[PDB]
Design a binder for this molecule. Sequence first.
Ligand SMILES: CC(=O)Nc1nnc(S(N)(=O)=O)s1
Ligand SMILES: [Zn+2]
Length: 262
Amino acid sequence: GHHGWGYGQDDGPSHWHKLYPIAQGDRQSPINIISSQAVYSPSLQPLELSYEACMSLSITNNGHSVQVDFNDSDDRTVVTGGPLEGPYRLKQFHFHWGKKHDVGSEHTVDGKSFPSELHLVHWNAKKYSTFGEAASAPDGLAVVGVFLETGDEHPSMNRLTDALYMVRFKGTKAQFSCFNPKSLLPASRHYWTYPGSLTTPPLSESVTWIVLREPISISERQMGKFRSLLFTSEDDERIHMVNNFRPPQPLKGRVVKASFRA
Ligand SMILES: CC(=O)Nc1nnc(S(N)(=O)=O)s1
Ligand SMILES: [Zn+2]
């Protein structure tokens, strides 16, 4: 659903459970990843992100985040391997960030947050006929999370942040052709994985999370651009889009697997 949920004081994460009871379920996301507790799992096949150069459609400010959607009408742009059984098509990717440098990411590692976190959302189109249907099944979705830390300016990120002024207001969009999501990935394919859920309503527990170990780097300037976005529409009082993240949720005995040893 998408109703009276947001990130404000009255409709924020702490209130979601009222309209979305699944909010206090057995496998909610995000979580705090205690690295020493992750289970090295060598049996898992290599994680592969096979993305196309021009499958991107538009970039949109939907009031919760800035999102880039893709054509999923076919099987070209998918994630596979790792804990996944079969390919999952990329539907869209978006970000979560904070008002300050020490907050922003949804998942945290050993209690530490990153200024932002990228989410590439995929669904099992092979066995379910619609994202809505896949979203209701425990094995219907796969979300790849990528942490962002501030450092060197990120090349492909320039085009994305440059387009943020145009979509500064809620409900606005622009064409965003030929953006290869592969450009927002780190060199390493090491990851952590665990059964979880969507981090925004409906909070469906149908997500196989794959959180990459190595973060990508963007500049503070680029980060500042995300913070210039607004939760509000054109003729409404301005409220900047920041702290659009859900805090860590109870692990509840779940096992986090790792594709590497540390
Ligand atoms: C329609 C759709 O994709 N909904 C999502 N809700 N939460 C998501 S997230 N932050 O877990 O990637 S994606
Ligand atoms: Zn997300």
